[PDB]
């Protein structure tokens, strides 16, 4: 069957540009108001939703979708990508976002990320939130510091939450040159120092059988 995609935005120019670009992935239905979308009985696999709608908040509709049909991917179209705005997206349960103005190509890429790789931009684990689109990590609502390598490994573990990732897998995936296995242990220690309350009783990153690591939400 085909993917069903809904686009809810009061800007008819956005509806046209977005619909034309996303039709290559599946069937697209457009809506100018939240009321129109809330009236439709057909379920969608993906909903593109503007944060600002004439009758509802895009954040509230997002919340409604996630509480009723959580399997639905939701990507928000917003005007700001500052921390306050991104945190509102996390709060609403959104899976990703795209800041306006944008080239439809960016949106297409993020929707493909949903449907073809089942990955997303916003990973909410309570006190720990990872924005893979803006490359930011928040701890209790405040941005923290993580060098690129540490961020990439933390994200990889989180995208594979509940699964054991071997030290070997990490060594071959995040380093182009040959490196000592201890380098992985060092990166993990640095990540833990950055996100755990006490880097000795991991809440997020556990060591497993001494051969790998696992992220627990």
UniProtKB/TrEMBL annotation:
Please list the GO terms describing molecular function. metal ion binding; phosphorelay response regulator activity; transcription cis-regulatory region binding
Extract one GO BP annotation from the record.
Answer: regulation of DNA-templated transcription
Give all 4-aspartylphosphate modified positions: 50
Positions bound to Mg(2+) = 9-10, 50, 52
User: DNA-binding: present as a keyword of the record?
Assistant: yes
In terms of domain of life, where is this protein from?
Answer: Bacteria
Q: Which Pfam families match?
A: Response_reg, Trans_reg_C
What positions does the domain Response regulatory occupy? 4-115
Asked whether the UniProt record includes Metal-binding among its keywords, one would answer: yes
Q: Which SUPFAM superfamilies match?
A: C-terminal effector domain of the bipartite response regulators, CheY-like
Q: What GO terms fall under cellular component here? A: cytosol; protein-DNA complex
The protein depicted here goes by the name Response regulator
What's the source species for this entry?
Thermotoga maritima (strain ATCC 43589 / DSM 3109 / JCM 10099 / NBRC 100826 / MSB8)
């Amino acid at each position: 069957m085909m993917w069903k995609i809904a686009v809810v935005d009061d800007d008819k120019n956005i509806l046209k540009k977005v619909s034309e670009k996303l039709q290559q992935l599946g069937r697209v239905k457009t809506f100018l108001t939240g009321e129109d979308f809330l009236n439709d009985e057909e379920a969608f696999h993906v909903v593109v939703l503007d944060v600002m709608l004439p009758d509802y908040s895009g954040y509230e509709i997002c919340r409604m979708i996630k509480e009723t049909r959580p399997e639905t991917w939701v990507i928000l179209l917003t005007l700001l990508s500052d921390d306050e705005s991104v945190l509102k997206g996390f709060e609403a349960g959104a899976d990703d976002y795209v800041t306006k103005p944008f080239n439809p190509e960016i949106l297409l890429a993020r929707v493909k990320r949903f449907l073809e790789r089942e990955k997303k931009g916003l990973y909410d684990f309570g006190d720990l939130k990872i924005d893979a689109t803006g490359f930011t990590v928040f701890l209790k609502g405040k941005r923290i510091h993580l060098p690129k390598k540490e961020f990439e490994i933390l994200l990889f573990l989180a995208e594979n939450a509940g699964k054991v990732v071997t030290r070997e897998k990490l060594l071959e995936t995040f380093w182009e040159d040959p490196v000592s296995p201890r380098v992985v242990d060092t990166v993990i220690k640095r990540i833990r120092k950055a996100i755990e309350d006490d880097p000795n009783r991991p809440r997020y990153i556990k060591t497993i059988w001494g051969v790998g690591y696992m992220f627990t939400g």
